[PDB]
Design a protein around this ligand. Structure first.
Ligand code: HEC
Length: 99
């Protein structure tokens, strides 16, 4: 299944724009699992694309989102190629749940 420990290690690339305490280039990911996309993050300025996506960050949507952000939400301002290893994606999600 998804392993938080492996996920903490795979989260390295995400650190550049995300943290769990404050907004920076990217919004804070605190409590992002199961939350509505582009609506929280203490008032972070989300793109119109994400905010109007109407998506809910469940495991299914996060899986697609991390594999290829722009294909899931054309026009997002999250500039990241995506994680092509499904197991790695699951690990990252297990990690996010801990936050
Ligand atoms: C900077 C270059 C980023 C990297 C590297 C990663 N992310 Fe990101 N993320 C970034 C931005 C600018 C945004 C806002 C996107 C927009 O279109 O408004 C995001 C958004 C997310 C979200 C959605 C959060 C929300 O509250 O809906 C998630 C869930 C997310 N990012 C996760 C994520 C992870 C796990 C990354 C590593 C694999 C990662 N991001 C990389 C900027 C950047």
């Amino acid at each position: 299944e998804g392993d938080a420990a492996a996920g903490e290690k795979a989260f390295a690339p995400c650190k550049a724009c995300h943290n769990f305490e404050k907004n920076g280039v990217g919004p804070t990911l605190k409590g992002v699992v199961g939350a509505k996309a582009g609506e929280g993050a203490d008032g972070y300025a989300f793109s119109d694309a994400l905010k109007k996506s109407g998506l809910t960050w469940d495991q299914a949507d996060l899986k697609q989102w991390l594999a290829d952000p722009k294909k899931k939400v054309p026009g997002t301002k999250m500039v990241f190629p995506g994680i092509s290893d499904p197991k790695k994606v699951d690990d990252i999600i297990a990690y996010l749940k801990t936050k």
